[PDB]
């Protein structure tokens, strides 16, 4: 029933678009109107906010496509896919880099001031934006608009199923396993050193760290699972009827709509929770 | 405390003037040099170094 899709997905897309644009605009406005020097964690905030801004601005086209199928041309779909891929990969890579920086700052408190600066100023650029641009070549090559029945739809069109399987595996590998392992390892090492502490300031940070981990996986773990099962269907190793395929499709759509919430949750978690950012915003407002 | 008494005696034997005369002198000085004051009267950007 297309009623569910038409009445359910565009509304969520619009709400996510509004919340994300508001949050990222506020974060950019606060960061830009900063008179003092830029710390090692404000650059990460700027990178994350930019990536979320691109991911937010690529939403209205998907919302329209949900309402009325694609009629915007061929080049525009390629541009939308490229922007979507760039933002999606850059966001998680920036999150992993932030986790590594926090691990360096906490565990190696006194003898880690040069490694963090070098890591940011060079490795952020290289390892966040070069792998993100190199992964948009399939978007340039295959993302084309095609007419099916009386409708026009645009998405990646592979020659056969082998390319679909290998590219889905690459998507899973680059989107979940690597940033997931980095974030989990760094934050689990950080937590273990703050659990036995007695000070007040070492109990709030813990209460803020164990949240972040969840906010990653609870946003991303189900969605890839939906893909992980789906690829197994394409490999002819899972054998049930068309009902299983239909419910897998519905699960993937719903959970992707859920996972699109990172672009608006990240400003809440990585920026608005800290007291330093709130004080800076209060000075910037006045 | 002889030094304090001597200082008070030294600083007490002076001739003062009326407050009105000093106020009038200050007002006259302020009025006379009011023309040459870039802060009181804005200066056009042609002659503004900043």
């Amino acid at each position: 029933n297309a009623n569910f899709n038409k009445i359910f997905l565009p509304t969520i897309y619009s709400i996510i678009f509004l919340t994300g644009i508001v949050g990222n605009g506020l974060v950019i406005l606060v960061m830009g109107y900063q008179k003092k020097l830029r710390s090692m964690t404000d650059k990460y905030r700027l990178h994350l906010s930019v990536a979320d801004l691109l991911f937010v601005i690529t939403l209205p086209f998907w919302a329209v496509d949900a309402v009325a199928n694609w009629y915007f041309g061929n080049f525009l779909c390629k541009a939308v896919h490229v922007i979507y891929t760039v933002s999606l990969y850059s966001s998680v890579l920036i999150l992993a880099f932030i986790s590594l920086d926090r691990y360096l700052a906490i565990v190696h408190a006194t003898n880690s001031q040069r490694p963090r600066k070098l890591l940011a100023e060079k490795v952020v650029y290289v390892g966040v934006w070069i792998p993100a641009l190199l992964l948009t070549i399939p978007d340039f090559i295959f993302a084309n608009v095609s007419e099916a029945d009386d409708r026009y739809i645009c998405d990646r069109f592979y020659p056969n199923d082998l390319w679909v399987v290998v590219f889905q595996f690459q998507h899973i590998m680059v989107g979940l396993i690597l940033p997931g392992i980095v974030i989990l390892s760094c934050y689990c090492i950080i937590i273990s050193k703050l659990s036995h502490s007695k000070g007040h300031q070492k109990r709030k940070a813990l209460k803020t760290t164990v949240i972040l981990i969840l906010a990653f996986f609870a946003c991303w773990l189900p969605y890839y699972i939906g893909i992980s099962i789906d690829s197994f269907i394409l490999l002819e190793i899972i054998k049930q009827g068309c009902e299983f395929e239909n419910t897998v499709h519905k699960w993937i759509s719903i959970t992707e709509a859920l996972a699109f919430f990172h672009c608006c949750l990240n400003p809440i978690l990585y920026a608005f929770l800290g007291a330093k950012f709130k004080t800076s915003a209060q000075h910037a407002l006045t | 405390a002889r030094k304090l008494v001597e200082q008070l005696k030294m600083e007490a034997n002076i001739d003062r003037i009326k407050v009105s005369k000093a106020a009038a002198d200050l007002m006259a000085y302020c009025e006379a040099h009011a023309k040459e004051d870039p802060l009181l009267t804005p200066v056009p950007a042609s002659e503004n170094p900043f």
Binding site: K36 | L8, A12, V19, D37, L39, F50
Partner: protein, 335 residues
């Protein structure tokens, strides 16, 4: 026995001061046209300091200035083009004052180290070197000014002032009489007298050549943090920690005008005048600077551009611009 004589002398002084009080300033200044609301906009924003800024001083050419910070830096800027001309690293990073020689050849600095350092700028080799070091004060230095290339007058935290000799490095004259710590100092335009405002809520007028105090002015409730002469050299203005400013006249030997407001409760860190002496710039602890009216005692403008307490304030010789420096590590020029 001496107490009775001192009380009688003080009573006679008060009676003489009250006798000469014919009419107040506000009574006879009511006919002049009030100045319009002053709106100054920042032109330059000098940056490069990494800590609080505690002093500044314009040059006599109205283009170069010097600023002292707690990061152990004394920077000579170029206000016109924002370029930094010099950046001298200090031996001690706890500095509270700075000065710029009238000839432009030397600079001075001092602070908690109890030593006034004179650095030479116009050197043949092009490298700034410590010209001289002056020691002998038993309290922290709070202000130091240049009479000429060979004489410097300092005020210390041991309730004393001193007139030195840079060539020999020895104290020439010592001014004593203050009870609390001396926090400010201002030289007369003719370099024949000066004033000192201390923590005993009183100001004193000293003669450089004679070496003896001439007049004493009182009327404040807390420590005096700043002082500045009127452009004609016949009056001065003081600011204290009880959120008020006062104007004293040497000839009348009594207070003339007071500047205060009910919305202000924090003290003044610095005061300055204008070229014609019509405006009384003052710096407050509430991150703001205020432009008063020296004749009508009415506020006429608020300069708000700093995120921290304003610590130093200055006006060029020709009055083209006003520079303010705060604990925000940023100087700002207003025109």
């Amino acid at each position: 026995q001496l107490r009775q004589e001192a009380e009688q002398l003080k009573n006679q002084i008060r009676d003489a001061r009250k006798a000469c009080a014919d009419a107040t300033l506000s009574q006879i200044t009511n006919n002049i046209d009030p100045v319009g609301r002053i709106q100054m906009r920042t032109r330059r924003t000098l940056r490069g300091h990494l800590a609080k800024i505690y002093a500044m001083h314009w040059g006599t050419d109205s283009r170069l200035l010097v600023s002292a910070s707690q990061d152990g830096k004394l920077i000579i800027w170029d206000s016109y083009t924002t370029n930094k001309v010099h950046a001298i690293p200090l031996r001690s990073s706890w500095v509270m004052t700075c000065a710029y020689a009238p000839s432009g050849n030397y600079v001075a600095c001092g602070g908690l180290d109890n030593i006034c350092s004179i650095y030479n700028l116009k050197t043949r080799e092009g490298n700034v070197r410590v010209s001289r070091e002056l020691a002998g004060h038993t309290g922290y230095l709070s202000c130091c000014r240049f009479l000429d290339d060979n004489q410097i007058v300092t005020s210390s935290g041991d309730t004393t002032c001193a007139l030195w000799d840079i060539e020999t490095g020895q104290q020439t004259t010592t001014f004593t009489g203050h009870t609390g710590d001396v926090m400010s100092l201002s030289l007369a335009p003719d370099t024949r007298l000066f004033v000192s405002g201390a923590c005993d809520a009183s100001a004193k007028l000293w003669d450089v050549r004679e070496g003896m105090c001439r007049q004493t002015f009182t009327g404040h409730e807390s420590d005096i943090n700043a002082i500045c002469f009127f452009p004609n050299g016949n009056a001065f203005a003081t600011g204290s920690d009880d959120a008020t400013c006062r104007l004293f006249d040497l000839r009348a030997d009594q207070e003339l005008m007071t500047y205060s407001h009910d919305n202000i409760i924090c003290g003044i860190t610095s005061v300055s005048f204008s070229k014609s002496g019509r405006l009384l710039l003052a710096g407050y602890d509430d991150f703001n600077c205020n432009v008063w009216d020296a004749l009508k005692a009415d506020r006429a403008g608020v300069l708000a551009g700093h995120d921290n307490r304003v610590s130093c304030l200055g006006v060029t010789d020709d009055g083209m611009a006003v520079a303010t420096g705060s604990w925000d590590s940023f100087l700002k020029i207003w025109n």
